[PDB]
């Protein structure tokens, strides 16, 4: 999973943010 503050975009690759964080975007954001 992606640790806090790192790049995320679940709709692109399905990789989730590590709990308990969520992505600020579906395509290009950060886990916070």
């Amino acid at each position: 999973c992606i640790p806090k503050w790192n790049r995320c975009g679940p709709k692109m690759d399905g990789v989730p943010c590590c709990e308990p964080y969520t992505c600020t975007s579906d395509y290009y954001g950060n886990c916070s």
Partner: protein, 471 residues
């Protein structure tokens, strides 16, 4: 690589997020130079993907290295570098070199972007120039983080001689056009071994723009290291500076009451931060100001935000960067644009604030006033440190400047400012104008002592005075 190459008597880099080249050129002459700023970090100037809705992040999906984006073409770019450099304000390029696009489409210059087949004709790049697909999903594995695709974006292979050549050419082209350095995007997702080679192939800065002979491009890298990962920020400080993410996180907490201000007495490497000369610090950046929490201070929480920025600019630690945002309610929302997708230029109001949807934090009196403070105290160290053993602190920078903060209770103390006798204008609430202080003023006695007053109910929780704002 670690020298910002600022002109004499200047400090701070302002991120003019999504600003056009023509507007930055104007800003360099009319505001940045007069207020003593050192440089501007510009948004990616190379051709990138035209994404649906024109979000801010489309700029982080390169299609080629042609200098033509919503910010302008190469002519506008050169006009900007010529004018800014003449004004003594440096330009730092946001270099997106870890990847290309995450989907098919066209770039801002009309070039084709074929993510599916890994073809980018304008460069050109083909399948052999990328790492075999896989996705970044395990930060405890350095190889996964660096060699796989970051959120679906095709991952370039900087190990390839062809690719290195292309990247070196792009960066040297920027150097020829007068840039002073680079903000390296997603540095953590690239191998230091490849980066050292690339940065070593960069030519010295162009003397035609006012740089000294032998000047090397300033390199500052985005790593995002908060501990507990396979990759460390220390792996990148051998060839450049690293953007110290821990700085804003710790300051954001302290100034929001999560830590007593008196504890900032040993602020620096003891707190787990990089050695000062290797760090570029900031309170918030374009990425983290869009958060699902409130750990990061932004323009939407004015009071503590300005306090953190003031502390950053008063303290001698690192090279400082100031964020300059556009108003937003949604995280994917792009900058102000018209019906056709063209960027709307910031308008300058009579009170020096911006219109058309730009926050312009760099134009806030409390912010530029502190940039002036930093210039006035250049070369000094923290002295006369004081605290009420809680949330009220004060300290001077040599005998050139003094600053006081309160994040709890009213501050009313006769403190030793270390400053020469005289009447000083508080640069936070006002400034020296027409021979008088437009805001608060502080009278320093023959001994350097002075009555400092700062109510917890004032619009700001910081007071700052220095020798260049003296009556």
């Amino acid at each position: 690589q670690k020298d910002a190459n600022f002109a004499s008597g200047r400090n701070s880099i302002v991120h003019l997020f999504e600003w056009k080249w023509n507007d930055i050129a104007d800003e360099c002459e009319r505001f940045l130079q007069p207020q003593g700023f050192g440089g501007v970090q510009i948004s990616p100037p190379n051709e990138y993907l035209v994404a649906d809705g024109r979000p801010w992040w489309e700029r982080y999906q390169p299609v080629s290295y042609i200098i033509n984006t919503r910010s302008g073409d190469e002519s506008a770019f050169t006009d900007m570098t010529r004018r800014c450099n003449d004004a003594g304000v440096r330009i730092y390029v946001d270099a997106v070199i870890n990847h290309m696009t995450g989907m098919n489409g066209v770039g801002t210059s009309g070039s084709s972007a074929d993510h599916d087949g890994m073809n980018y004709p304008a460069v050109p790049y083909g399948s052999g120039d990328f790492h075999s697909p896989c996705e970044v999903n395990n930060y405890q594995d350095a190889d996964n983080v660096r060699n796989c695709e970051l959120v679906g974006l095709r991952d370039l292979n900087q190990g390839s001689d062809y690719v290195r050549g292309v990247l070196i050419d792009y960066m040297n082209h920027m150097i020829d056009l007068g840039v002073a350095g680079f903000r390296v995007d997603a540095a953590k997702h690239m191998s230091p071994g490849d980066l050292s080679v690339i940065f070593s192939g960069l030519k010295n800065l162009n003397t035609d723009y006012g740089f000294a002979d032998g000047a090397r491009p300033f390199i500052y890298q985005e790593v995002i290291d908060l501990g507990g990962e396979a990759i460390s920020k220390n792996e990148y400080t051998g060839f450049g500076c690293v953007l110290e993410f821990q700085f804003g996180v710790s300051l954001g907490n302290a100034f929001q009451g999560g830590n007593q201000l008196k504890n900032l007495a040993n602020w620096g490497p003891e707190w787990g931060l990089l050695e000062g000369l290797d760090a570029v610090v900031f309170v918030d950046n374009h990425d983290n100001q869009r958060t699902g929490g409130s750990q990061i201070l932004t323009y939407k929480n004015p009071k503590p935000y300005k306090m953190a920025i003031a502390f950053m600019l008063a303290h001698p630690y690192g090279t400082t960067r100031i964020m300059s945002s556009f108003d937003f309610t949604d995280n994917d929302q792009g900058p102000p644009q018209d019906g056709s997708g063209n960027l709307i230029s910031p308008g300058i109001n009579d009170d020096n604030t911006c219109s058309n949807g730009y926050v312009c934090e760099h134009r806030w009196r409390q912010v530029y006033g502190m940039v002036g403070f930093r210039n006035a105290v250049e070369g000094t160290q923290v002295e006369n440190w004081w605290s009420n053993d809680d949330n009220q602190i004060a300290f001077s920078r040599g005998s050139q400047g003094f600053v006081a903060f309160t994040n709890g209770g009213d501050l009313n103390q006769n403190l030793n400012t270390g400053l020469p006798a005289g009447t000083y204008c508080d640069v936070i609430s006002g400034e020296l104008s027409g021979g008088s202080c437009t805001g608060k003023s502080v009278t320093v006695g023959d001994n350097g002592s002075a009555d400092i007053s700062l109510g917890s109910a004032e619009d700001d929780g910081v007071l700052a005075i220095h020798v260049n704002a003296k009556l």
